């Protein structure tokens, strides 16, 4: 379903855009429904949850008797849902804002996060928006640049920081948006080097053998060294075996 919004560069420039979800992990539309062993009816079973205190007598506490609390080191800090709603981070939803422009080399592919890729087109039946978006896409492509943007699906969706980069094809041109990491999601692990390790250095014969292996198991072929490459095992066109 198309997602309409406005690409904003400051408080003066605004381009009407529509976003679609291009790539996402697909799950089964239907789910297994638990049914009674003998009657084979869904109405004959019922699921419910009960909370009981940790005392020996095993008292019973109703659902209205529980308040959510968090952990602060070695203690527990009560924090009611209503108080959390009062203190929650409030944002203005439906934002597609351009925080800045940055060189493509600085945005690496191993830092992409999220579970979706968005394709941003100009708004339907709008020549002016099409021209504006085409101008931005061509400028970014010529400069070899990407746009670091803030994205919020709606009022209650947590704001995200992501990258929009150009995608120009003969038929159509569009921006492609993929999420980027915050400071909290980065892991700082140190790994031992392999080039400088003395006991793991391969010999020349081993390198030649691995070269032969790589050459033999090539999954692409040149078209008689004439125009371009051809893929021998295209995985993007293979249906998902799970559903089959």
């Amino acid at each position: 379903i198309h997602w309409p919004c406005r690409l904003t560069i400051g408080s003066n420039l605004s381009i009407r855009i529509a976003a679609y979800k291009s790539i996402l992990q697909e799950r089964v539309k239907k789910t297994w429904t638990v049914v009674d062993a003998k009657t084979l009816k869904k109405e004959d079973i019922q699921k419910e949850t009960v909370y009981c205190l940790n005392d020996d007598d095993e008292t019973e506490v109703l659902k209205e008797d529980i308040i959510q609390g968090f952990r602060y080191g070695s203690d527990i800090v009560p924090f009611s849902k209503v108080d959390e709603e009062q203190m929650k981070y409030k944002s203005e939803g439906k934002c597609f804002s351009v925080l800045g422009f940055c060189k493509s080399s600085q945005v690496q592919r191993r830092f992409f996060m999220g579970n979706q890729v968005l394709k941003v087109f100009a708004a339907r039946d709008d020549e002016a928006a099409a021209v504006a978006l085409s101008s931005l896409i061509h400028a970014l492509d010529d400069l070899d640049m990407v746009a670091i943007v803030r994205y919020a699906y709606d009022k209650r969706a947590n704001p995200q920081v992501g990258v929009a980069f150009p995608h120009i094809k003969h038929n159509y041109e569009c921006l492609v948006y993929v999420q980027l990491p915050f400071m909290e999601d980065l892991r700082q692990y140190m790994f031992s080097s392999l080039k400088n390790s003395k006991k793991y250095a391969p010999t020349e014969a081993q390198l030649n053998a691995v070269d032969a292996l790589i050459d033999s198991m090539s999954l692409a072929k040149k078209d008689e060294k004439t125009d371009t490459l051809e893929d021998l095992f295209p995985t993007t066109k293979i249906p998902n075996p799970r559903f089959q």
Binding site: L99, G100, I148, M183, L186, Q188, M190
Partner: peptide
């Protein structure tokens, strides 16, 4: 090792989040 944090040893010290600062 240089850059090691003084609070949690064994982890790289994260530089403060500076946000967007436009170049000259």
């Amino acid at each position: 090792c240089p850059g090691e944090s003084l609070i949690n040893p064994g982890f790289k010290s994260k530089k403060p989040a500076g946000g967007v600062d436009f170049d000259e």
